[PDB]
Amino acid sequence: TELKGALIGCGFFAVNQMHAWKDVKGAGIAAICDRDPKRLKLVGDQFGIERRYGDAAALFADGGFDFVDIATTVQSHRALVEMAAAHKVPAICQKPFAKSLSDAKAMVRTCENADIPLMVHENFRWQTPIQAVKAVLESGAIGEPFWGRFSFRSGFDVFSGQPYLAEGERFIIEDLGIHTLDIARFILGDVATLTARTKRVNPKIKGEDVATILLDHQNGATSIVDVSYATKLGTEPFPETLIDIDGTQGTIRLSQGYRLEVTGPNGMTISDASPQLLSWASRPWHNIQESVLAIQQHWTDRLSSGGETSTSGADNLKTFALVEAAYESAANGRTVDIGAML
């Protein structure tokens, strides 16, 4: 009784998704699809997949899978989610959700009308350390949260591993900040208003590589989301998100090296919140790679129980709005209203 999945987009990151599908219990991959025959062969051979397609339409016409995992680039997300809805196939879609908030909304409305589950593969909130911060905060250990910082500052050459990122007129917020904004929603709740600034430092890219964002949360909390790929430190933190939360009765400080510090009324604890290094994982991306298992296992459990997933399409609109709002704000110079976009 394993769920049979089809994966569409056998790119670099899909390799991680395929390994994790292997580990996931109650689901496995019965078919793959990619436009590039060399990627289709590499992944099909690596993972022992007999069913191989050069195009998604043909895959969907043949059928015989219970869900679809869409790990293509953003251009094809809307069409592939629409094809899944039309064939009543529950769907997972990689980030970014779509090219616009407008496209993402329509994709959500189509999967609601087809009565199928739609999950965005937004895995940063599923990292072990981020989950731990969530659990501490939910316990009431530090009372009500009023302030936060969510920070990802790196000097890591990500432009080798994928050199199209150096090409877009937009870069760090769409590629990385999207995750940091999602973490900030996950911890501190939905955002009412957003103000952002962006800067290009690296002479060799088109897009912005520094973004500083100020979030007014609906629950009254204020937070800072700062991201950078132009930050040159003496020990490289890639790809760790560092988090500070202040509450009425204490603080949470998740610092470099997965160190989790919690001060409350009953003193102060320090714990290790680092990931399990999986058999197929690789330092220092083992953080991100564990989260792939966590989120796919979450999808699979929720597909059996019939519950809404945590980064459902509907939920992810509220993250996606913050990406579009930040680009709008940085160009305008203006604070953007989030509720008026949704």
Ligand X SMILES: NC(=O)c1ccc[n+]([C@@H]2O[C@H](COP(=O)([O-])OP(=O)(O)OC[C@H]3O[C@@H](n4cnc5c(N)ncnc54)[C@H](O)[C@@H]3O)[C@@H](O)[C@H]2O)c1
User: Which parts are annotated binding residues for substrate?
Assistant: 95, 162, 175, 179, 229
In the bound complex, what is the minimum distance in angstroms from residue 95's beta carbon to ligand X?
Answer: 5
Give the residue numbers of the binding site: 12-13, 21-22, 24, 27, 34, 76, 94-95, 123, 162-164, 175, 179, 229
Give the residue numbers of the binding site for NAD(+): 12-13, 34, 76, 94-95, 123, 162-164
Nearest residue (CB) to its own copies, 26 versus 284: 284
| Contact map string, positions 46 to 65, toward ligand X, x by CB under 6 A | ----------x---------
**Subset of residues 60 to 119 that bind ligand X, contact rule: CB under 6 A:** 71-74, 76, 94-96
Buried b (16+ CB within 10 A) or exposed e, 282-294: eeeebbbbbbbbb
- 183/186 Cα distance (integer angstroms): 5
The strand pairing partners of 51, in sequence order, are 31
Task: Return the number of other C-beta atoms located less than 10 Å from residue 66's C-beta.
Answer: 15
DSSP 22-82: HHSSSEEEEEEE-SSHHHHHHHHHHHT--EEES-HHHHHHH---SEEEE-S-GGGHHHHHH
Mapping DSSP to helix (H, G, I), strand (E, B) and coil, where does residue 217 land?
Answer: strand
| Contact map string, positions 118 to 157, toward ligand X, x by CB under 6 A | ---x-x----------------------------------
| Binds its own copies (CB under 8 A): choice among 88, 99, 170, 334 | 334
Cβ atoms of residues 92 and 115 within 8 Å: no
| Binds Mg ion (CB under 5 A): choice among 6, 14, 24, 221 | 24
CB-closest chain residue to ligand X: 11
Mapping DSSP to helix (H, G, I), strand (E, B) and coil, where does residue 338 land?
Answer: coil
**Subset of residues 261 to 320 that bind its own copies, contact rule: CB under 8 A:** 261, 263-264, 267-268
Residue 157, Cβ density class (10 Å: 0-12 exposed, 13-18 middle, ≥19 buried): exposed
| Binds ligand X (CB under 6 A): choice among 36, 112, 144, 272 | 36
| Binds its own copies (CB under 8 A): choice among 158, 224, 278, 314 | 224
Per rule CB under 8 A, is residue 159 in the interface with its own copies?
no
- 250/294 Cα distance (integer angstroms): 29
Residue labelled with tokens 């990500």: 158
Question: Which H or E run includes 185?
Answer: helix 178-188
Nearest residue (CB) to ligand X, 151 versus 311: 311
Residue 28 binds what, of its own copies, ligand X, Mg ion, none (CB under 5 to 8 Å, by partner type)? Mg ion
In the bound complex, what is the minimum distance in angstroms from residue 258's beta carbon to its own copies?
Answer: 17
| Binds Mg ion (CB under 5 A): choice among 11, 28, 143, 189 | 28
Cβ atoms of residues 12 and 162 within 8 Å: yes
- List residues near Mg ion by CB under 5 A: 24, 28
